[PDB]
Each structure stands twice: as C-alpha cells, then as structure tokens.
C-alpha cells in the first residue's frame, strides 16, 4: 500500500481542481485544469509518478478508466491503473471531507492569491504540513522509507 | 542539509525549463515556462514547497534573488531564499551536467511526446527512477525520514 493513489477531481469557481490523494498517509497533489478530460488526466499523472514512487491509482471514473490517453500514460510510468470503485463505502465519505477541507483551505487563502491555481498550491501547502501526532508529508516519507527498507 | 535545493533555469526549442535540486540526493521537479519572471519562480517554489520540506532554496539567479514576487512566496511558505552562489566550484559544474543530462534524455523520449512539457516530465521520471545503488527518488525520501526520526 506504499505505492497507492486514489484521484478525485472535485469543482470550485467554474474550475476544476485534480487531486491525487495518497490513501496510506492523507498526502495530497492537486491543480487547477479547465476541464477534466483524458489528456489532462494523463499529464497529471505522469507529473505524480516522476515525483512519488506511484505503483497503483485508483482512477476517479469510468471515462479516465476507459481514455486512451490515460492507459498510455499509465503504461508509460508503470502505473496499474484500477477503478476506484468504493467497495469499501467509509472511502467515498473519506473522500467527501477532504474536498471540503480542502474548499474550507482555499476560502481561507483565496483573498492572498489573484489567482484560483494559486490559493490550490497553498492549500496542498497546508493539508501536507498540517499536524495532526504527524503530517500526511510525514507520514508519506516514512511509509515509503519504511517499504524501500 | 535535508532541507536545501537549488534552483536551475535551462532553455530548449526556445522555451524555459525551471529545475529545483535537491542538494543532498540530486532528486528534481521541473517545468516548462515561457519565460523566466518571478512571478513564474514563485508559483514554482510554492508548489515544491507544499510537496517536500523545503526550508532554503540557492536561487539561480540576482534576479529571482531580488524579485518582490519571488520574496513574498519564500516568506508565505517559510523558505529562506540564499543567493547560488558556488563558493564551492563544483556546484556550477554538476549543475551544468545534469543540465546535460536532462537534455539528453528529453531528445531521447522527445518523439514520444506532442509537447515539450511532456518530454520533461518523462525526463523528470527517468532522472529521479535511475538507479546510480540507489536512486534520487529513494535517497530523498531516506534522507528526509532520517531527518524526522
Ligand atoms: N509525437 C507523437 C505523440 C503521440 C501522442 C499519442 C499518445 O497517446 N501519447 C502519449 C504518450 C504519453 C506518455 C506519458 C504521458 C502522456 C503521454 C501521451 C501524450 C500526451 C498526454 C497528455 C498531454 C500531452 C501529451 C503529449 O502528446 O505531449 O501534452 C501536454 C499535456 C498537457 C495537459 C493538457 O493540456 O491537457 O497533456
Ligand atoms: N489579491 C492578491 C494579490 C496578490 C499579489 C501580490 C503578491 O505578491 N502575492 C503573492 C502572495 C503569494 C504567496 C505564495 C505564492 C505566490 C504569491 C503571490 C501571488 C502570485 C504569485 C505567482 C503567481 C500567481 C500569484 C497570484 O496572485 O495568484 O498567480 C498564478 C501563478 C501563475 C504562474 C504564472 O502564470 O506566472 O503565478
């Protein structure tokens, strides 16, 4: 479970914002993109797997399931691309809450930032560093050393 | 020592591609940028710094050094911005060979990709996967779960 993703594409201000959640520790990346669409999808992902060892994601719907472009992308960077289908039904609610507290971060920042890509960096900024006792930025790198190890 | 990248701005088919280093495991996060401004910079730095424990980065330029822009994402994300400058001479040689390096392997996957943004993320990937032994991405996560332990 080092290596797994969940994706989660949630809306604010006419936008879409692309979150890469990181299932074991809570550590998230994120961007702001027009629309989400395969090519988007794709070149997100590779972006996440040069980054983080990203064995497994978990996509975040049947339409980036199904896209070519993010098979490719997936074969590509090793990735195993699976449904992200809640059969465990406490990780849709888990889900659910992040985007809320990720929209509750970016209303705090939003005045900050002319932009809405901007006021996203600095909410991944501080969901990572949070304490909450560990960071989700702590717990990443400890469960990744820990499986290199 | 956990904590320090340098900054490195490279140019390819008349673009900018902006490169953070971590010191210690030669780890990198790149993008491509039609220029180099600081607003550019700043957004970058933000976003490394949201992603790993950044708390000083080398700034390749007086430039960068001197932006406004480029100060007040430093102060927002608790970074302490040091000039680049090699007092140690083999810092402008090392970063010249990645520079290097980066450029080869982006003409080596540089058929693979429409667009040069791409291209660098895949040389993003291989550079920080490439075992020297241990890889980049793997001294970087060890060297920062050391550091928190
Ligand atoms: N020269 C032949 C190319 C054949 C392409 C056919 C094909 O499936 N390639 C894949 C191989 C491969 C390998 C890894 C990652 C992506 C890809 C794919 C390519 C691709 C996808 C998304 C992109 C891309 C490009 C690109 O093509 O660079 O570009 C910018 C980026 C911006 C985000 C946005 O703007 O949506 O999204
Ligand atoms: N009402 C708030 C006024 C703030 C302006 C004064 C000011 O110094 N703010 C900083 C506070 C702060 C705190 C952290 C990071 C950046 C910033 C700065 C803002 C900023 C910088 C670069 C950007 C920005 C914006 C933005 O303003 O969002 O936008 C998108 C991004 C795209 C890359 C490109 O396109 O170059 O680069």
Known sequence: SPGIW?????????????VAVHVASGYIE?????AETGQETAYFLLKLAGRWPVKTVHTD???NFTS???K???WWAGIKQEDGIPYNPQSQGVIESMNKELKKIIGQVRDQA???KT???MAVFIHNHKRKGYSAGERIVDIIATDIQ
Do not use: M, R, W, Y
Request: with cysteine; glycine share 6%.
């Open 6 to 18: 969940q994706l989660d594409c949630t809306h604010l201000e006419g936008k879409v914002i692309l």
């Open 30 to 34: 994120a961007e702001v993109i027009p």
């Open 61 to 63: 719907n049947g339409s």
């Open 68 to 70: 070519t472009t993010v």
């Open 72 to 74: 490719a992308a997936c």
């Open 114 to 116: 002319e932009h809405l």
């Open 119 to 121: 006021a996203v960096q």
